[PDB]
Design an enzyme around this catalytic site. Structure first.
Site, PDB file in Angstrom:
ATOM      1  N   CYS A   1      28.518  89.590  52.281  1.00 43.63           N
ATOM      2  CA  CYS A   1      29.709  90.227  51.726  1.00 43.63           C
ATOM      3  C   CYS A   1      30.599  90.870  52.784  1.00 43.63           C
ATOM      4  O   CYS A   1      30.141  91.783  53.462  1.00 43.63           O
ATOM      5  CB  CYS A   1      29.305  91.299  50.706  1.00 43.63           C
TER       6      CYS A   1
ATOM      7  N   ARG B   1      32.039  95.042  52.362  1.00 41.89           N
ATOM      8  CA  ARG B   1      31.084  96.130  52.191  1.00 41.89           C
ATOM      9  C   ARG B   1      31.576  97.486  52.663  1.00 41.89           C
ATOM     10  O   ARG B   1      30.822  98.456  52.513  1.00 41.89           O
ATOM     11  CB  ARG B   1      29.752  95.830  52.892  1.00 41.89           C
TER      12      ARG B   1
ATOM     13  N   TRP C   1      37.189  92.731  43.904  1.00 41.34           N
ATOM     14  CA  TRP C   1      38.486  92.068  43.806  1.00 41.34           C
ATOM     15  C   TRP C   1      38.430  90.901  44.807  1.00 41.34           C
ATOM     16  O   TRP C   1      37.501  90.849  45.618  1.00 41.34           O
ATOM     17  CB  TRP C   1      39.668  92.992  44.052  1.00 41.34           C
TER      18      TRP C   1
ATOM     19  N   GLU D   1      39.477  83.109  49.168  1.00 36.71           N
ATOM     20  CA  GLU D   1      38.551  82.570  48.165  1.00 36.71           C
ATOM     21  C   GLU D   1      39.316  81.642  47.220  1.00 36.71           C
ATOM     22  O   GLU D   1      38.839  80.580  46.827  1.00 36.71           O
ATOM     23  CB  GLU D   1      37.863  83.683  47.370  1.00 36.71           C
TER      24      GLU D   1
HETATM   25  C1  HEM Z   1      35.570  95.304  46.555  1.00 39.63           C
HETATM   26  C2  HEM Z   1      35.799  94.005  46.920  1.00 39.63           C
HETATM   27  C3  HEM Z   1      35.009  93.059  47.570  1.00 39.63           C
HETATM   28  C4  HEM Z   1      35.464  92.004  48.297  1.00 39.63           C
HETATM   29  C5  HEM Z   1      36.882  91.777  48.821  1.00 39.63           C
HETATM   30  C6  HEM Z   1      34.360  91.104  48.415  1.00 39.63           C
HETATM   31  C7  HEM Z   1      34.445  89.968  49.223  1.00 39.63           C
HETATM   32  C8  HEM Z   1      33.409  89.034  49.246  1.00 39.63           C
HETATM   33  C9  HEM Z   1      33.592  87.674  49.697  1.00 39.63           C
HETATM   34  C10 HEM Z   1      34.849  87.127  50.362  1.00 39.63           C
HETATM   35  C11 HEM Z   1      32.438  87.034  49.433  1.00 39.63           C
HETATM   36  C12 HEM Z   1      32.202  85.525  49.503  1.00 39.63           C
HETATM   37  C13 HEM Z   1      32.329  84.835  48.150  1.00 39.63           C
HETATM   38  C14 HEM Z   1      32.253  83.325  48.262  1.00 39.63           C
HETATM   39  O1  HEM Z   1      32.580  82.752  49.326  1.00 39.63           O
HETATM   40  O2  HEM Z   1      31.843  82.708  47.254  1.00 39.63           O
HETATM   41  C15 HEM Z   1      31.557  87.990  48.812  1.00 39.63           C
HETATM   42  C16 HEM Z   1      30.192  87.763  48.691  1.00 39.63           C
HETATM   43  C17 HEM Z   1      29.305  88.679  48.147  1.00 39.63           C
HETATM   44  N1  HEM Z   1      29.683  89.907  47.609  1.00 39.63           N
HETATM   45 FE1  HEM Z   1      31.343  90.916  48.027  1.00 39.63          FE
HETATM   46  N2  HEM Z   1      33.175  91.678  47.983  1.00 39.63           N
HETATM   47  C18 HEM Z   1      33.607  92.820  47.311  1.00 39.63           C
HETATM   48  C19 HEM Z   1      32.898  93.393  46.255  1.00 39.63           C
HETATM   49  C20 HEM Z   1      31.584  93.072  45.879  1.00 39.63           C
HETATM   50  C21 HEM Z   1      30.741  93.951  45.089  1.00 39.63           C
HETATM   51  C22 HEM Z   1      31.232  94.954  44.037  1.00 39.63           C
HETATM   52  C23 HEM Z   1      29.476  93.472  45.174  1.00 39.63           C
HETATM   53  C24 HEM Z   1      28.287  93.943  44.632  1.00 39.63           C
HETATM   54  C25 HEM Z   1      27.939  95.059  43.926  1.00 39.63           C
HETATM   55  C26 HEM Z   1      29.560  92.293  46.006  1.00 39.63           C
HETATM   56  C27 HEM Z   1      28.423  91.617  46.417  1.00 39.63           C
HETATM   57  C28 HEM Z   1      28.487  90.430  47.156  1.00 39.63           C
HETATM   58  C29 HEM Z   1      27.407  89.480  47.280  1.00 39.63           C
HETATM   59  C30 HEM Z   1      25.990  89.705  46.756  1.00 39.63           C
HETATM   60  C31 HEM Z   1      27.914  88.393  47.905  1.00 39.63           C
HETATM   61  C32 HEM Z   1      27.240  87.032  48.072  1.00 39.63           C
HETATM   62  C33 HEM Z   1      27.503  86.040  46.944  1.00 39.63           C
HETATM   63  C34 HEM Z   1      26.798  84.709  47.069  1.00 39.63           C
HETATM   64  O3  HEM Z   1      25.807  84.596  47.823  1.00 39.63           O
HETATM   65  O4  HEM Z   1      27.227  83.742  46.391  1.00 39.63           O
HETATM   66  N3  HEM Z   1      30.768  92.272  46.668  1.00 39.63           N
HETATM   67  N4  HEM Z   1      32.159  89.228  48.693  1.00 39.63           N
END
Ligand code: HEM
Ligand code: HEM
Ligand code: H4B
Ligand code: H4B
Ligand code: CAC
Ligand code: CAC
Ligand code: ZN
Lengths: 414, 416
Positions: free
Chosen positions: A118, A121, A290, A295
């Site tokens: 992520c 973070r 968000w 993406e």
């Molecule tokens: C606040 C905004 C946030 C942004 C901009 C964001 C951004 C990202 C991005 C760009 C990815 C890659 C997604 C993909 O390529 O399919 C991602 C992955 C991830 N995000 Fe974040 N994130 C945020 C919020 C969240 C929150 C609220 C959580 C968890 C409570 C989260 C947990 C994760 C996890 C677990 C992954 C891995 C997903 C996977 O393995 O398919 N993120 N996030």
């Protein structure tokens, strides 16, 4: 014993000592690195033929309770001692245990913090945690989910949130959300092998239909949810359109862009991962934040196996699609990402571009070096799918490892 | 199923198993506890200097393995020539602590080192490599002659041809042959009073080594450096390449008339000269190799890295972009036009170049060939995926297995 980690743009060096806190093994070995694989069957949290061994379970729970009290600084208080004894008591007699809500809230935020894929973070401290563990029916899950979405969308001023449904139990089947995200566009495999809509969702689209959904025929038809209560067939729920905020895509200067009829939804909410806290497993725990604009503009709209719009936009731009060397793909992709940012901004829906986001991740890395002596991160997922070395994270060495609490992949329920 | 890494392509949905990694005999930097895949130099791809001859028993196993590779390749494994060659190597090492390669063994080993290179996206060309055998070289001035010949052959007036020149191997009781420069062609990097740098900041130390070895510096942005060449146990000697041998391409843009006025350029020949060629445990500390450029190496990294020529903002300003906010995508817009200029200019000048789309498409074909030929191909995803337009190319969607096979190109410490 501890990796030396270098940033090649600034020349700075740090040492990752946090990785010594990992207790779960990843897919690499000294003989070959498998860092680029999306899912090895290994780290994946699959069903089991019974109740986990009590010693393992209590080791993970003690460490977690230990994390929690250290976190509120009462590490060593009597409260600490006492909570450890309750957990011990409950495991020894029932083979399992339960989390207090405040513990659950700490655990969910720590799982996000630990998520090496992520890039967002820096917000990890800011998460609305909805406790949905008093849920006993699919109908109920639907109501909690509809509540997640209203809260999280917030008229375009998105707020991060997670809803936690009842943990897995040795005695029964799981609570599951079958959809991979709460909002998904249908993928219809029309006659000639083709796909109308989002090819990533052909299988879930099919399951929906098979379970009584009456399909539409557009390129952006929002799918119903398939929600599953333990040991029962999933049930079909159609989201109220008013709850699904969407953004039609236009370009700030190309008039004809709007005519492509393109759109994307405001809320990214992943619903098929498993949330593990202290050895306990939440098989239904959808989370949302968000979007980062790449993406949408880059992967969802330009991947060859997704909407694949690159050539349409290039022809529209009158680009020389004849040869690779005209960089028609590069040029079309920039404008499509620009159209995404423009449209969200105009519709006043939260979004973050890949430069802003990676800059913030660099600050996050710095914070976590100070806070915990490192940060687990997956270079291939953190560097964006366009303009990689134009962003600071490309030049940053990263150490990847699994910390717990964790979000994990799990088998599809069907 | 199979007891090997299962590898998937997410664009195509196809699956393969890597069995070649079974052959890996040298450990990388990763462990089950944490992946170090993104580190540029972990201490698992770098070969420190052996002030002492490698232990006979370690040498021989490495030698026998390489000789088995050579005889398998010509399909005479188990043969009388095979057994005889092995015996000969064991005797050479047995009496002199080292051994020597036959000419055709060196040619095989060098092509194999390239094939085995996990960070190279150009390996579909691996079978076509001119191997210059310079193992008779006995002085710094002779290395210089060998290198100029290399450059003339490889450059071929713009119709580039891959090549490597191999100098004598590391020898017990003798210092190393070394080229101090990291590439045969390098632009000077001059530190300024301000602490800024004029020219290429990657080359500040070598520029200063040159000076300290008697070169008289210029003060341009693109001054070609002299070569610091070192024969065994001798101080290095300074050699200046005749301008006519170093082909350069002035950069212009196909539609943006002002880009030419930027006065930008790049040289035609990418020739890495500080890496160690390892074959059958033998170490060639000086063995410069060259190919042709992929356009992003120049247009994206060399010209736009913040710690290199850093020209993004300059070009964005000329395009009149909003450089005050990230979401205008000014860096993305400029980069694209800088890479297009590079491609356009190289084409116009009729100098060989490959765009990153064509190159990764060719690498996908190579991966297919190699699956059949050897059941896999070691590949470093972070280096294979280009620094712009990543998921717009096929390699982004291809999972990869990374491991160290020998013969190998290895990093080695700086000679100073
Ligand atoms: C606040 C905004 C946030 C942004 C901009 C964001 C951004 C990202 C991005 C760009 C990815 C890659 C997604 C993909 O390529 O399919 C991602 C992955 C991830 N995000 Fe974040 N994130 C945020 C919020 C969240 C929150 C609220 C959580 C968890 C409570 C989260 C947990 C994760 C996890 C677990 C992954 C891995 C997903 C996977 O393995 O398919 N993120 N996030
Ligand atoms: C014919 C054209 C070739 C193409 C287009 C090509 C392309 C590339 C690219 C783009 C890289 C990355 C460079 C960087 O990011 O610094 C690379 C690295 C590499 N190539 Fe190739 N290559 C070619 C030929 C050569 C040949 C002839 C050899 C050797 C016989 C070679 C051996 C390597 C090695 C060992 C690396 C890694 C060096 C390092 O770690 O810095 N390649 N090549
Ligand atoms: C094979 C390769 O790992 C795969 O394409 C990865 C690469 N990096 C990615 N990065 C992000 N953020 N999301 C993805 O889905 C992927 N896919
Ligand atoms: C930190 C990171 O490993 C480093 O920036 C790598 C990434 N990928 C690369 N890829 C190529 N081709 N060349 C490089 O120099 C790098 N640098
Ligand atoms: C703009 As065209 C369709
Ligand atoms: C071309 As300049 C502004
Ligand atoms: Zn690894």
């Amino acid at each position: 014993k501890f990796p030396r980690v270098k940033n090649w743009e600034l020349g700075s060096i740090t040492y990752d000592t946090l990785c010594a806190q990992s207790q779960q093994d990843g897919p690499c070995t000294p003989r070959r690195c498998l860092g680029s694989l999306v899912l090895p069957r290994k780290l994946q949290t699959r069903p089991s033929p019974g109740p986990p061994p009590a010693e393992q379970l209590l080791s993970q729970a003690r460490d977690f309770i230990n994390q929690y009290y250290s976190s509120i600084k009462r590490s060593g208080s009597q409260a600490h001692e006492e909570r450890l004894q309750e957990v011990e008591a409950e495991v020894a007699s029932t083979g399992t245990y339960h989390l207090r809500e405040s513990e659950l809230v700490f655990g969910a935020k720590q799982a996000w913090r630990n998520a090496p894929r992520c890039v967002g973070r820096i917000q990890w401290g800011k998460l609305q945690v909805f406790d949905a563990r008093d849920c006993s029916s699919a109908q109920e899950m639907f109501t909690y989910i509809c509540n997640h979405i209203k809260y999280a969308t917030n008229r375009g001023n998105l707020r991060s949130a997670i809803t936690v449904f009842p943990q897995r139990a040795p005695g029964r089947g799981d609570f599951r959300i079958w959809n991979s995200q709460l909002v998904r566009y249908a993928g219809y495999r029309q006659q000639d092998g083709s796909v109308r809509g989002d090819p990533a969702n052909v299988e879930i689209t099919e399951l929906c239909i098979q379970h009584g959904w009456t399909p539409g025929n557009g390129r952006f038809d929002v799918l119903p949810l398939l929600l599953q209560a333990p040991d029962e067939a999933p049930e079909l729920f159609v989201l109220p359109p008013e709850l699904v905020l969407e953004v039609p895509l236009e370009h700030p200067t190309l008039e004809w862009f709007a005519a492509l009829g393109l759109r994307w939804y405001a809320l990214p909410a992943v619903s098929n991962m498993l949330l593990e806290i202290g050895g306990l497993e939440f098989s239904a725990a959808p989370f949302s934040g968000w979007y980062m604009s790449t993406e949408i503009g880059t992967r969802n709209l330009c991947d060859p196996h997704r909407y694949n719009i690159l050539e349409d936009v290039a022809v529209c731009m009158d680009l020389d699609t004849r040869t690779t060397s005209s960089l028609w793909k590069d040029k079309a992709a920039v404008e499509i990402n620009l159209a995404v940012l423009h449209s969200f901004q105009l519709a006043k829906v939260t979004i973050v571009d890949h430069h802003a986001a990676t800059v913030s991740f660099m600050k996050h890395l710095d914070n976590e070096q100070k806070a915990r002596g490192g940060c687990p991160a997956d270079w291939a997922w953190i560097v964006p799918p366009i303009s990689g070395s134009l962003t600071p994270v490309f030049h940053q060495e990263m150490v990847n490892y699994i910390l717990s609490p964790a979000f994990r992949y799990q088998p599809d329920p069907w």
